[PDB]
Amino acid sequence: SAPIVLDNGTGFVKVGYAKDNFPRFQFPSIVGRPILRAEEKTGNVQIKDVMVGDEAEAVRSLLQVKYPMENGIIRDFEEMNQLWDYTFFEKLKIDPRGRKILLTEPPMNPVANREKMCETMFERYGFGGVYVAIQAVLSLYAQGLSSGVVVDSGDGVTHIVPVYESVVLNHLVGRLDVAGRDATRYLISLLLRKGYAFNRTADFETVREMKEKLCYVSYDLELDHKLSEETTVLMRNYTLPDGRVIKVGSERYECPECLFQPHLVGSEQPGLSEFIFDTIQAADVDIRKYLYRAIVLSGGSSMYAGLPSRLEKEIKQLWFERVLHGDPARLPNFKVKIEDAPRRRHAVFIGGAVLADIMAQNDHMWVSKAEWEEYGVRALDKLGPRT
Amino acid sequence: ETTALVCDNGSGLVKAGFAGDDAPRAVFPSIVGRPRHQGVMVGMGQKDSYVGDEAQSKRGILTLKYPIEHGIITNWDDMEKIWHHTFYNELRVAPEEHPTLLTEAPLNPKANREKMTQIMFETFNVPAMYVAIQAVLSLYASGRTTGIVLDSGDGVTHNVPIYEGYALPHAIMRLDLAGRDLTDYLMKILTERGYSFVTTAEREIVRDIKEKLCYVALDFENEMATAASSSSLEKSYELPDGQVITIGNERFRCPETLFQPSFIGMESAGIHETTYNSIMKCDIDIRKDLYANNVMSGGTTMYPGIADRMQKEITALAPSTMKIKIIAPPERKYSVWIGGSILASLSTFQQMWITKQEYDEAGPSIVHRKCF
């Protein structure tokens, strides 16, 4: 009946229908092959040939996990085919031929990835409709706003896109190659500082949950260095699901610091706030307020504790240092407002669900199966002529 | 006739309204905007084009264009678009029930007359219309039967000496220098301060800079020499984006282009040499009153202190044996509209309109036969 919407994110998969509010099902984009190591390997129920999704992440102890998507693109495609099969056949267990699907994709992906993903979706499933939309416009839809710049930070890659009054500035879209996965890798290294080693595959998800529960974004660097240098209050105790406890100190505020200082992970690209400032400044002089006045955080990786406050303070400070050249006279004449909606993690899904019935009931807006087969790959231009 | 409409299709601004009134309900820059960014977002009905105050408000994304340049028209499609805007949006009156008054500068090519009159005929089917020169209304607004005028606008500046109901056609000349060229030179001189303005949207803010932070000096060499201690003349302008502008000698350099056109590669007589030549080419018996019956009109003459400089300069060129005066009404900008309304308010002007019955057999060429 209602069109289906799919958000195949790098670290998670969300799926649902139109008019929905919260994602119907969310599960990591993982594929589990069976493996036997030096564990106890209790035979809970059974181990099948290929286990993916919630069952995979639950039985992860006895299986190795491979991530089909890296850096926002699909590395190995057979595993990702298994992922769509799982999602369509048991997560929703409804697999008609001819339904309408609205896909998602970060802005500056290779053409081949999107083209062959659409080809797979057509041929292997036979769906009668398709549409691929940027996550940024969906994030904009989530709050119903029309003008403003929205930043999306996920597991794979963080991107920002400025939109002013229902016009997407395709020549100023952002792409910062630092995301939650890089933060997790830096967390693993920072734990290797002390002596703890996480070289298994389930340990990756373990430390991901650790960073989920404990790590936080600093608001004042020198204050937190003083706190971690003189006081032991920052120490937290975390017990692994295996049952072992470790000590975490400065790692809590040093893990997500790589987002703001990418040189920690060996990235030449500027930090989050600096990149946002450059993107806003490169725009025309007329829309600069509405770019500053409405900055919307989105994505799972933006859920860091104390991130909106640090972002607002840092953007104001950087404006003061870069424009006013140290003059504090005109500082109180600046209006910046970072949006921090509670569901900025599923803003992409919410925007996709809204767009599902925004443009429904008229198939002449997107691509059909016949049009695809008789205009080849080049038929995939009705969606958008983005750069 | 119920009501009479008068409209002066000026190069930058368009003024329209019912005759016999004082406040124009239809004033807005002659701007046609089109979305430059091809990529658009589905929904909310992205309009194909924008015109008027709406276009000015959304100047950030569009690429605004001026249908009129130097007075000649190049964008007749935009002409019908803006005329439709004027007739329907902000007047709410059906065009086919009221007469219209049209204006333009002298020495306009005849084909312009033909096309404007012909589109007035078919595209709108208005009852009747008349077209004349802007300077005629400029003088008629003041209620003066004789005196030279200087109609400086956004794209046209022309001098029209006027006798008792007539004029000396050998004595009218029109100068292309106007607000557009002033804006261009202002950009070319503000590139000094590091400020850059290339996009049309930035042209629209350069125009505001000129409107609000410009004045005319009285003795350019002396004041430029004393500007070496640039402390009492520099001002501050707040750009829309949020920074500040420290305007300097360019706040008075750009309007000086009118007096000396040699700074824009225009080897032409100055704004006072043109007046001197025009009056000297007039009759000897009217040199006396033409020396002291000059008026200011249009939006270009809003410069503070330009009247005193113009008066003293034309006095310097003129013989000192007799007195010189200047007339600068505080409504120079709407003088043309007021004159048009007054002329259409004439008790006996209803028979000088041109209804359908003439064009039903005559054709567009008869406008030069009677209308002027």
Added chain:
Amino acid sequence: ETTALVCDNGSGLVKAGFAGDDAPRAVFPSIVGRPRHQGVMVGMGQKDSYVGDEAQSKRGILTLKYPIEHGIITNWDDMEKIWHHTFYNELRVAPEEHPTLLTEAPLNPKANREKMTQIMFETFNVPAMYVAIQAVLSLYASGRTTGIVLDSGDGVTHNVPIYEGYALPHAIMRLDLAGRDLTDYLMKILTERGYSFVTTAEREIVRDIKEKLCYVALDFENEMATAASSSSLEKSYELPDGQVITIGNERFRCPETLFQPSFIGMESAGIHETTYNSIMKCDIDIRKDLYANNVMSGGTTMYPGIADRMQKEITALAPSTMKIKIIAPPERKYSVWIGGSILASLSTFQQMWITKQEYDEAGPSIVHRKCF
């Protein structure tokens, strides 16, 4: 006087060498590299900042950033460091003896020129110096005196028409599209093939790729249609790593921005239309001659096949009765330097230097009363 020095501080590269010669003594990128690793290697004297060819050699670890932005210097400290490096490494002559010569973009914010001459007189003690626009040097390079110079480099591009004797300042057009923007757009479109370049050293690698494997299409839609069968437009490159890069229509898509600025979202007219407008602004007495001579100069204009498309499109815009030729010197990269050397070699130029003796009592503003 022993000799003379010419240093064209371009946005990307610096061509410094003695006058009276056709081969530059030293040409190298204008990059100041500072390492981003606190893990100092104790010993073997590695210095805090790297400039010149050493920056290119060690770009694997430094953070390369140009000290010129669109022809405007913004990091005067690294500017003076570069000048120090030049004078006492690649020239090995103290500036106290040999006078220098500099080049400046037209319509440049003159605070740049003032600070330039001030800092040179302060920290270099040059006996004398001069500043000239690259356009006049480009015109002098071919030995003629007519034509309009299309000088496009790393920061900005500009056109300055000129007849025998005197130039036409009101017709000078300048656009910021240049080699840096071309490299940026090439990097932006390379990610559509899966190849990602983010670091500054990667920017240099992409710039080398653009040097080696780029050309301008004769007809854009025709070549795009030809791109249906990936036969001839497809080439390969060898990365310094050892990788292999496959390049397609991006070979000719990125130089197209010179003619379609909307590709990178810059509202403007392509350089061909800019040249056409600039020549049209000239009077009828001068364009009949300026059409024939079109001087092409700069690093960007070295593209293979750009001259043919330039010629065909300029004749497309111009009336069909015109004969237009494009000048394509095989030494266009150093054309500005050769023009400067020729200008300095003339014995009729020693009179209008800028000596310290006149500078002391006139201050830094003398650069405006002397040069132009």
